[PDB]
Amino acid sequence: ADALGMIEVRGFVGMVEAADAMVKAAKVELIGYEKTGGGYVTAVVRGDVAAVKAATEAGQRAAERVGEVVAVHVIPRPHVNVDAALPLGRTP
Amino acid sequence: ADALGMIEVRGFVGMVEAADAMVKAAKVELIGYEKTGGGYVTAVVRGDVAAVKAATEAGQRAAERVGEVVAVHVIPRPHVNVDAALPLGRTP
Amino acid sequence: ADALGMIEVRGFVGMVEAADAMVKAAKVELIGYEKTGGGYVTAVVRGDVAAVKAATEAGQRAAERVGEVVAVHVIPRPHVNVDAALPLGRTP
Amino acid sequence: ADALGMIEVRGFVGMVEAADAMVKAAKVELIGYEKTGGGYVTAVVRGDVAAVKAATEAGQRAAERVGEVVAVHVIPRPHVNVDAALPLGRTP
Amino acid sequence: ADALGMIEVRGFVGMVEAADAMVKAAKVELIGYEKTGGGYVTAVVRGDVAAVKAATEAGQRAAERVGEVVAVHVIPRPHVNVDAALPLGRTP
Amino acid sequence: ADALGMIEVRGFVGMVEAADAMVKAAKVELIGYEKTGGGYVTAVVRGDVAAVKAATEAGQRAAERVGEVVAVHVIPRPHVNVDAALPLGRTP
Amino acid sequence: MVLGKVVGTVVASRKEPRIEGLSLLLVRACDPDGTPTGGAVVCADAVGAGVGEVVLYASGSSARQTEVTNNRPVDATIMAIVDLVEMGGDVRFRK
Amino acid sequence: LRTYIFLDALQPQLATFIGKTARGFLPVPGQASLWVEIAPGIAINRVTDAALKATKVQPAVQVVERAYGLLEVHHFDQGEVLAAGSTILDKLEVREEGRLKPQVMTHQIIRAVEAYQTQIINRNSQGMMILPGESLFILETQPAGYAVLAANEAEKAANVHLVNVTPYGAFGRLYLAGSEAEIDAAAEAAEAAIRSVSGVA
Amino acid sequence: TLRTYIFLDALQPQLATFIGKTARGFLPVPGQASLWVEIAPGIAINRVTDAALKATKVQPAVQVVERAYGLLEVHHFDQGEVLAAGSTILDKLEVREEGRLKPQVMTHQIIRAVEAYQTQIINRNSQGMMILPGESLFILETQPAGYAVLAANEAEKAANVHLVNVTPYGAFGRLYLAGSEAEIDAAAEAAEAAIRSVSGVA
């Protein structure tokens, strides 16, 4: 389906700044966020591969000025079972 | 919509002092707080850009005397999808 | 029943990359994930012993490029009580 | 009338990046730009004082990564004759 | 709207070589050029984000062999007011 | 269409000497010149690739004895959009 | 700090030589919604105020706590331009 | 042994291209695949016998007409294909890390190929057609077998179309074609796959 | 006897790529007008080719002499020179637009969810794109054969499909289309409405 972009920040404030920069950077859909405990929150965007890649670059640049960026990654085409089994916005 | 201000403190006491100083500083609306685990709590205020900016400056000054301020940030105009997908008080 | 494969990553992003590589590597069923707090998430796949073993090798190789891999393990035939008492996808 | 924000860049590319960051940062109105020869272009935004100030901060941060920022300045309330005699978007 | 790519060269010859390489590199639309005085000319292309990015890379590589490249920048999604207020080809 | 040759000189006198040598050297059509401010003028010739190349070599040799040659370049086949968007003599 | 409104300017020609370069503004004190009510105060500009603005001005020795008005005979200086005045749940003044 | 690569689950485009260009038991998407390359090209029949008798894997490809001995075998169970690969490597008396490591010679993406280059590239290709004006990636690897593995990784990364994956010959050349960002991601994944197989240089 | 005379206003970037792969002649680039003439004596297509080349500045891509029939393509960027070449072709045969044979649609089927074995059979004799194991498939047979490229042009104009194969020469004209069924429906409707809107002699 759509390409997947994820920015995990240890801190809600850096994640909201990351998500804001991701959505302002390109045409991506912020589907929401994942709390995994311990202060770790992950913002998840879905969209075209170039849109997700440019969005995730800008979100990393803006979240490194605010918080502690744990991980930034773009999956250009996730598997069908990954969308079926994980909260990534494109579940049927 | 409204401007967004966030102060994340590792500690509930410093967050309540931050939120108290933010609301006493200017006309902002404390919408509540976000627990992300690990001791991290984020106080979220919404209002005009100058009100949110002055409130967040005073909240940082008061929370640094009490607790451990992780992150302080003001978004002057968040995107519509950010308000739709994140618990930031202005969701439809 | 089916063989069990588990990859635990401290971080949701590395776990989603691990789960994506596990499902793309072989015929395994990603049943979901386990949050144990502190940032620790475990992706759990079920399937044949060779499928689970090759999937878990590829998931470890892909999650070490993204996040912090805590533990990777394959149980070729778990006990009946383990499936009955733990959230491992094959509970009756 | 409205507050005035101006970013002068020696270079059209840095001015377009400045203007893009100014309009994405806050609710300001980019009225256009002023060519004074020699490579100097000035982007002019109008709006509320906090909106113009936050916009002009973000526009300076984004134009310093691209071009040569000559001058950045915010006038919180320009005089009536300044709007009447200069191309600043609020002329009657 | 469309992504924006701009190459500013101090010199008309390097700008025509930049624009020629940009249009031959990918599917972008050269909308024209902006003279800001002092010898500075800016070639402006519009198109998809990957097309504009690859075009602008090739245009920079070809204009550095000819002239003096002042600034090269790609805006993946400019704001609506930027297209409304600046001569960037997508004005209504 | 026709091949494009351009000589940019900082100075009108060196450009007229360049244009005179270009037209006397081979069968090219001097379409005119481009003023970009700051003293920079560009003479533009159109014609066959060998004619334009020999003309532009002779124009560079004659303009280096008079003025300050900024840039000399031959485009053997410019794109259709380059002729449509730039003042290069072959616009429809 | 007194919340006031800038009403006019004062141009002095023969002045004390330390205060040369200072813009002297006539500021009347105002109620929190912005109507001038009171006598006028000639005060030095330190922020860039113009005629019609609601400002905060400081008077006394604290009027010299500025790099602009440091060791000058300045007993009143404008220290802020006011964006919003809010009086208990209600905005009384917007900029 | 020059190459030894197991494709653990074949992607659909690589399966269709491996079944439009091979004479043998045609692969299905996505079963499994083992590919081995040794010299001379007559012992591929011995390796194919010692793998097809001692497993349930079907024989997909065996190459001797163009180059040295390359054999690809395909079963739907990863355990049976791994058993057949272990039998083919024990018959050759070599270990898994005894193959020549794949040197990635060329890796070049040509953005927005012209229509003339599109017709010349499509006239010599046994797969999907590079349409006129699109990015095209072209890799080369030594030995020629591991390039086939690269194709699978490309089809796993992004939605790029595969034009031609030459697993046979002296050098292994792969040509893929798609949109610019998709072909960039596919080319990055193909070069990352063809430069991670450990071996003996 | 003029069996097939159809004019294409512009070639899609994939039918033009297919003719750039399979033809013996000057290959067509996309976005230019083409023209297909099939006549009933097979050797007589050389005279039609000679008329269209001495008249105008069009280029031939396909000149196929069948067991019995003859097929010719001409193409150029300007539609005026290809229409002038077609006027020359119709004046050489002394026929008109409507002397062509009206095409029969003998088979049109949307085979949805094609199994992997049928794809491994069908993308082995095909020259165009590969069909993937699980996509849909539209097959088409038209008589005479030269109209098939018409159905290959108007299908891709109205969908996003894969041109697996088109055979425009021989007894029957064949067309295979791949893609998702929501767009195979649109390409099938466009191809059928393109073929059945063709006048001629029944």
PDB file of N, CA and C in Angstrom, chain E residues 49-79:
ATOM      1  N   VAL E  49       8.077  15.795  -6.840  1.00  0.00           N
ATOM      2  CA  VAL E  49       9.158  16.034  -5.886  1.00  0.00           C
ATOM      3  C   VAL E  49      10.430  15.311  -6.307  1.00  0.00           C
ATOM      4  N   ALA E  50      10.297  14.079  -6.799  1.00  0.00           N
ATOM      5  CA  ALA E  50      11.461  13.348  -7.282  1.00  0.00           C
ATOM      6  C   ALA E  50      11.960  13.911  -8.599  1.00  0.00           C
ATOM      7  N   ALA E  51      11.034  14.301  -9.477  1.00  0.00           N
ATOM      8  CA  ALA E  51      11.403  14.902 -10.750  1.00  0.00           C
ATOM      9  C   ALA E  51      12.129  16.220 -10.542  1.00  0.00           C
ATOM     10  N   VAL E  52      11.605  17.063  -9.652  1.00  0.00           N
ATOM     11  CA  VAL E  52      12.232  18.346  -9.355  1.00  0.00           C
ATOM     12  C   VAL E  52      13.569  18.148  -8.662  1.00  0.00           C
ATOM     13  N   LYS E  53      13.667  17.154  -7.785  1.00  0.00           N
ATOM     14  CA  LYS E  53      14.908  16.947  -7.051  1.00  0.00           C
ATOM     15  C   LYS E  53      16.017  16.421  -7.960  1.00  0.00           C
ATOM     16  N   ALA E  54      15.699  15.459  -8.830  1.00  0.00           N
ATOM     17  CA  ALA E  54      16.688  14.942  -9.772  1.00  0.00           C
ATOM     18  C   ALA E  54      17.057  15.981 -10.819  1.00  0.00           C
ATOM     19  N   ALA E  55      16.062  16.740 -11.292  1.00  0.00           N
ATOM     20  CA  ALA E  55      16.303  17.820 -12.233  1.00  0.00           C
ATOM     21  C   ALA E  55      17.215  18.874 -11.642  1.00  0.00           C
ATOM     22  N   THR E  56      17.002  19.227 -10.382  1.00  0.00           N
ATOM     23  CA  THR E  56      17.773  20.294  -9.775  1.00  0.00           C
ATOM     24  C   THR E  56      19.186  19.834  -9.449  1.00  0.00           C
ATOM     25  N   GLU E  57      19.363  18.544  -9.138  1.00  0.00           N
ATOM     26  CA  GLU E  57      20.711  17.995  -8.991  1.00  0.00           C
ATOM     27  C   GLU E  57      21.482  18.057 -10.301  1.00  0.00           C
ATOM     28  N   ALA E  58      20.852  17.636 -11.399  1.00  0.00           N
ATOM     29  CA  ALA E  58      21.535  17.699 -12.688  1.00  0.00           C
ATOM     30  C   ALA E  58      21.776  19.128 -13.149  1.00  0.00           C
ATOM     31  N   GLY E  59      20.856  20.040 -12.840  1.00  0.00           N
ATOM     32  CA  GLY E  59      21.049  21.430 -13.207  1.00  0.00           C
ATOM     33  C   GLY E  59      22.169  22.087 -12.432  1.00  0.00           C
ATOM     34  N   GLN E  60      22.335  21.713 -11.164  1.00  0.00           N
ATOM     35  CA  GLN E  60      23.470  22.213 -10.401  1.00  0.00           C
ATOM     36  C   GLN E  60      24.784  21.661 -10.934  1.00  0.00           C
ATOM     37  N   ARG E  61      24.824  20.356 -11.247  1.00  0.00           N
ATOM     38  CA  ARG E  61      26.033  19.758 -11.816  1.00  0.00           C
ATOM     39  C   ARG E  61      26.413  20.381 -13.148  1.00  0.00           C
ATOM     40  N   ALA E  62      25.435  20.766 -13.961  1.00  0.00           N
ATOM     41  CA  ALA E  62      25.782  21.351 -15.248  1.00  0.00           C
ATOM     42  C   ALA E  62      26.071  22.837 -15.160  1.00  0.00           C
ATOM     43  N   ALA E  63      25.464  23.547 -14.216  1.00  0.00           N
ATOM     44  CA  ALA E  63      25.732  24.967 -14.096  1.00  0.00           C
ATOM     45  C   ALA E  63      27.019  25.264 -13.351  1.00  0.00           C
ATOM     46  N   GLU E  64      27.525  24.329 -12.548  1.00  0.00           N
ATOM     47  CA  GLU E  64      28.810  24.565 -11.907  1.00  0.00           C
ATOM     48  C   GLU E  64      29.975  24.441 -12.873  1.00  0.00           C
ATOM     49  N   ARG E  65      29.780  23.783 -14.013  1.00  0.00           N
ATOM     50  CA  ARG E  65      30.818  23.729 -15.030  1.00  0.00           C
ATOM     51  C   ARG E  65      30.861  24.979 -15.890  1.00  0.00           C
ATOM     52  N   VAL E  66      29.804  25.780 -15.881  1.00  0.00           N
ATOM     53  CA  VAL E  66      29.703  26.965 -16.723  1.00  0.00           C
ATOM     54  C   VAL E  66      29.859  28.236 -15.905  1.00  0.00           C
ATOM     55  N   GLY E  67      28.984  28.445 -14.931  1.00  0.00           N
ATOM     56  CA  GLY E  67      28.956  29.717 -14.245  1.00  0.00           C
ATOM     57  C   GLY E  67      29.142  29.658 -12.748  1.00  0.00           C
ATOM     58  N   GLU E  68      28.636  30.678 -12.074  1.00  0.00           N
ATOM     59  CA  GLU E  68      28.765  30.846 -10.633  1.00  0.00           C
ATOM     60  C   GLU E  68      27.406  30.555 -10.013  1.00  0.00           C
ATOM     61  N   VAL E  69      27.256  29.367  -9.439  1.00  0.00           N
ATOM     62  CA  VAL E  69      25.985  28.955  -8.858  1.00  0.00           C
ATOM     63  C   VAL E  69      25.855  29.593  -7.483  1.00  0.00           C
ATOM     64  N   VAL E  70      24.877  30.479  -7.335  1.00  0.00           N
ATOM     65  CA  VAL E  70      24.644  31.145  -6.066  1.00  0.00           C
ATOM     66  C   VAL E  70      23.857  30.247  -5.126  1.00  0.00           C
ATOM     67  N   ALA E  71      22.720  29.733  -5.578  1.00  0.00           N
ATOM     68  CA  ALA E  71      21.870  28.966  -4.684  1.00  0.00           C
ATOM     69  C   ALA E  71      21.068  27.943  -5.462  1.00  0.00           C
ATOM     70  N   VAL E  72      20.906  26.769  -4.866  1.00  0.00           N
ATOM     71  CA  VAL E  72      20.124  25.673  -5.419  1.00  0.00           C
ATOM     72  C   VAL E  72      19.220  25.171  -4.311  1.00  0.00           C
ATOM     73  N   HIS E  73      17.913  25.125  -4.561  1.00  0.00           N
ATOM     74  CA  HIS E  73      17.016  24.695  -3.501  1.00  0.00           C
ATOM     75  C   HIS E  73      15.742  24.106  -4.083  1.00  0.00           C
ATOM     76  N   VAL E  74      15.219  23.096  -3.394  1.00  0.00           N
ATOM     77  CA  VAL E  74      13.981  22.417  -3.757  1.00  0.00           C
ATOM     78  C   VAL E  74      13.009  22.559  -2.597  1.00  0.00           C
ATOM     79  N   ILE E  75      11.826  23.098  -2.873  1.00  0.00           N
ATOM     80  CA  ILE E  75      10.736  23.141  -1.904  1.00  0.00           C
ATOM     81  C   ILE E  75       9.724  22.074  -2.309  1.00  0.00           C
ATOM     82  N   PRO E  76       9.551  21.004  -1.527  1.00  0.00           N
ATOM     83  CA  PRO E  76       8.709  19.889  -1.976  1.00  0.00           C
ATOM     84  C   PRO E  76       7.234  20.213  -2.045  1.00  0.00           C
ATOM     85  N   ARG E  77       6.760  21.151  -1.256  1.00  0.00           N
ATOM     86  CA  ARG E  77       5.363  21.574  -1.308  1.00  0.00           C
ATOM     87  C   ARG E  77       5.301  22.987  -0.774  1.00  0.00           C
ATOM     88  N   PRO E  78       5.348  23.989  -1.644  1.00  0.00           N
ATOM     89  CA  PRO E  78       5.242  25.370  -1.179  1.00  0.00           C
ATOM     90  C   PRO E  78       3.829  25.699  -0.734  1.00  0.00           C
ATOM     91  N   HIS E  79       3.737  26.721   0.109  1.00  0.00           N
ATOM     92  CA  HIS E  79       2.466  27.149   0.662  1.00  0.00           C
ATOM     93  C   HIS E  79       1.631  27.811  -0.431  1.00  0.00           C
TER      94      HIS E  79
END
